[model samples]
Target: KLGDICFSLRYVPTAGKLTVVILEAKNLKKMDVGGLSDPFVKIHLMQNGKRLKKKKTTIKKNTLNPYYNESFSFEVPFEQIQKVQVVVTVLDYDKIGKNDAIGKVFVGYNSTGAELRHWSDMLANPRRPIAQWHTLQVEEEVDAMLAV
Candidate 1:
């Protein structure tokens, strides 16, 4: 089943970097039979065909819709803005075995021109948070999505 994840992005000119805030995720498909799945988000920062950084949100227990509302910042240089990519993954946590992947999505500097526009908007209006909703996709589909 597919789900929707909402997040906000902002470029902090003063800090010369980018900030990503995990706002919330809704309508997630339950992975556990006992109850709602414990959900969390994994964020990856990629640049120059290599993953540069990784960050994770605290796990929310037994909820289909989790409100993280957590903020994470990356020290990305302005010159590398065009090479940076952000990957967000939703995962179901398990105490006994390996965690299950719920879904994933990505946005990048080179993926589309709209991304730069979004960055520009955030920089112009630093006080306002630019939030967007994305339909979650699998890891395999990311390459195809970016190719277009």
Candidate 2:
């Protein structure tokens, strides 16, 4: 059975790696309800549902927002990581003073890729307001754009 707490993860692809951002709380509805002294966040990468590695983030203080936000990066080796999913877990100090998991988030590389399609296209469209959305006749055009 699922537990009480959960979180969300977002993969932001950068120049050579992917940044995994985590948001933690008791529930999705209450994600922005945590305090500054909340837990530290960590992300685990999984392949075929098996954990591959873990990345931890430093605990941060209040940032004018209630939710605990943390980020870690995974250096994605181009070919080795054909697919991967991130599992986010928060380590917290609660009322009993025990360090325990307070929340989690799950996101896959392929799913991230799908989301990036729209996001990338949106960002690409605005470089020139008068640019036309014309079909490219050469593969290099698409490849060059994807490389960016």
Candidate 3:
């Protein structure tokens, strides 16, 4: 479950308080028999324990490590930053069956401490993209966070 992904984030104060997250997934671990796989990313913005918005990147064809320089934006007010959480799920595309989840990770006040750090960094810099690399986690690890 140790795949790598790189992404950048920025908060645009002028664009209706838009929060932009740029995603680029790379060097994913092979989840198929032929050592090749198509992968894509699902992005969800959650607030008040509910999904507020959703976006997805186009699937890259036949490669374990596909580069996706994609971007998604959410209209969130400054006051709502603390209440918003971003969930990123990486999945392997299967032509013959249901897609398999490669791994997932999250960022935001409720998700990981790095979320605040990155958010603050973007605010302090303004228009500058704050990029970072993240390690993917298995679904079980995330399920524990939701367990009652």
lDDT of 3 by residue, 1-148 (tens): 4486777877766663544454577767788876568899988877655778899888998876778888888887766765666777888987788888888777775566665576567667756878887777886886465333
Residue-wise lDDT of candidate 1 within 9-103, one digit each (tens)? 87655565788899999999788777668999998888655668999999999888999999998987666655677888999998879888888
Runs in model 3 with CA error above 4 Å? 14-16, 19-23, 113-116, 146-148
State each model's CA lDDT, in order: 0.78, 0.43, 0.73
Stretch of 10 with least lDDT, candidate 1: 111-120
Q: Write the per-residue lDDT of candidate 2 for residues 1-148, one digit (tens) a residue.
A: 1122233322223333555444434322222355434456566777765667787766544432235455566666545444665555555434555655544434444433433343244334332211111111122332232231
Q: Estimate each model's TM-score.
A: 0.82, 0.44, 0.83
The 10 consecutive residues of candidate 2 with the worst lDDT sum are 128-137
Candidate 2's C-alpha runs over 4 A off are 1-16, 22-37, 60-70, 80-82, 94-98, 109-148
In the order shown, the candidates' Cα RMSDs to the true structure are: 3.0, 13.3, 2.4
Model 3 lDDT, residue 128, Cα: 80
Clash pairs for candidate 1: none
lDDT-based ranking: 1, 3, 2
